[PDB]
């Protein structure tokens, strides 16, 4: 059984593109039925790390469970969750964002150090997706995240990498100079994944529990 992505790419579908999500809901598939042309892909420009590896692993999975890895209402009390919308990902004429990610911004003129984690109790291998924002100008970065030396730290027994975003003026793509770079990992059952950052983090709103067999 294929997956029939249509105009959507895997990167667009894996992340929750707004014009994508209207057509996908499967649990046990084996193929792709996808067109590489991303009419509905990364609505925000950037690089999907280990994309090629990620298509192989998603292909042919027995189970597909989408669950709230970090509830938007409860997980981030000291940060703003309602202002992370853009026209690059606009839907039905209104600015929107990925259905599976979350753009934390400053709350009450402060971006406190954040520390949150998931201990994989689902007994199945879990797919966790996060992004790191790279703004175009220093003033936008200061307005949204306050700190000018931002850091993002993701640590697990299987994955460990610390991101340091930088302010770069990149050619305009989808009317946006800034970029988010997208990263992923697979969480073993019984393993914990930790996010520590002071800004520029696109937090995972939803994660996928799967079994390839």
């Amino acid at each position, epitope marked *: 059984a294929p997956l029939q992505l249509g105009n959507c790419s895997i990167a667009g579908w894996i992340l929750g593109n707004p014009e994508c999500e209207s057509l996908f809901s499967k649990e046990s598939w084996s193929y792709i039925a996808e067109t590489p042309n991303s009419e509905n892909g990364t609505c925000y420009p950037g690089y999907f790390a280990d994309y090629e590896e990620l298509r192989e692993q998603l292909s042919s999975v027995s189970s597909f469970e989408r669950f709230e890895i970090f509830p938007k209402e409860s997980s981030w009390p000291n940060h703003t969750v309602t*202002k992370g919308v853009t*026209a690059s990902c606009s839907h039905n004429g209104k600015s929107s964002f990925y259905r599976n990610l979350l753009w934390l*911004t400053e709350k*009450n*003129g*402060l971006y406190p150090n954040l520390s949150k984690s998931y201990v994989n109790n689902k007994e199945k291998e879990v797919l966790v997706l996060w992004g790191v924002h790279h703004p175009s100008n220093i*003033e*936008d970065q200061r307005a949204i995240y*306050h700190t000018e030396n931002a850091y993002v730290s993701v640590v697990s027994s299987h994955y460990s990498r610390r991101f340091t975003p930088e302010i770069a003026k990149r050619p305009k793509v989808r*009317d946006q100079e800034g970029r988010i770079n997208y990263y992923w990992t697979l969480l073993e059952p019984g393993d914990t994944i930790i996010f520590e950052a002071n800004g520029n983090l696109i937090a995972p709103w939803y994660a996928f529990a799967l079994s390839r067999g």
Partner: antibody, heavy 126, light 98 residues
């Protein structure tokens, strides 16, 4: 509901530090920015700067950087602008406004000036 | 930076009034309009009669069925990221004839 009260009109000789007070009620002082603008008599307004009570961070316009100093006291929920070194052209009415228009998008992340103060008349002529 | 507004506009009562605010790269940026009656602290224009429509290099504020109380001084405002400064417009003395 929310309101901003300002110190009354002070008259001073040129070269003297004049300080204006702006007090906030009906909202948690730590929440929003407070900007200061000035309006020369019969002219338009000129943005001067802003300060956030939660962080204490300040930011000034180029023309006003150096001589103006903006402080705050969370305990009394009051924000201050000090006008060190007065000169005649500073005679104007000075307003304080809170930035309560929350931005909708990350593209334009700027809180707009929703509620203003009564205005303080600073007169310097000697 | 350097937003430009008209010195004065005159509209007959019950008609429509348009105020032009010109500057570079208004584009994605929203424009806040402030209304200052004489001897009064300016207040933000929030919004049937009041409506804005920004397109490209110019933002416009339109008032429908102008009234005597609507008459005042109008001021557009935009934050300039590069200059890091909040920019205020020069000013519009709208005059509902009456």
């Amino acid at each position: 509901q929310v309101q901003l009260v300002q110190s009354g009109a002070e008259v001073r000789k040129p070269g003297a530090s004049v300080k204006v007070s702006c007090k906030a009620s009906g909202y948690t002082f730590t929440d929003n920015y407070i900007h200061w603008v000035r309006q020369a008599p019969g002219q338009g307004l000129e943005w001067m700067g802003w300060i956030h009570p939660n962080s204490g961070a300040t930011k000034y316009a180029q023309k006003f950087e150096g001589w103006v100093t903006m402080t705050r006291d969370t305990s009394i929920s009051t924000v201050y602008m000090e006008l060190s070194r007065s000169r005649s052209d500073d005679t104007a009415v000075y307003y304080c406004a809170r930035a309560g228009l929350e931005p909708r998008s990350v593209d334009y992340y700027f809180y707009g000036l929703d509620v203003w103060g009564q205005g303080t008349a600073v007169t310097v002529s000697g | 930076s350097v937003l430009t507004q008209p010195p004065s506009v005159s509209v007959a009562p019950g008609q429509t009034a348009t105020i032009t605010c010109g500057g570079n790269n208004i584009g994605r940026k929203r424009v806040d309009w402030f209304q200052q009656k004489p001897g009064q602290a300016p207040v933000l224009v929030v919004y049937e009669r009041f409506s804005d429509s920004n397109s490209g290099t110019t933002a416009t504020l339109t008032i429908s069925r102008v009234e005597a109380g609507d008459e005042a001084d109008y001021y557009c405002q935009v934050w300039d990221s590069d200059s890091d400064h909040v920019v205020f417009g020069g000013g519009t003395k709208l005059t509902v004839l009456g």
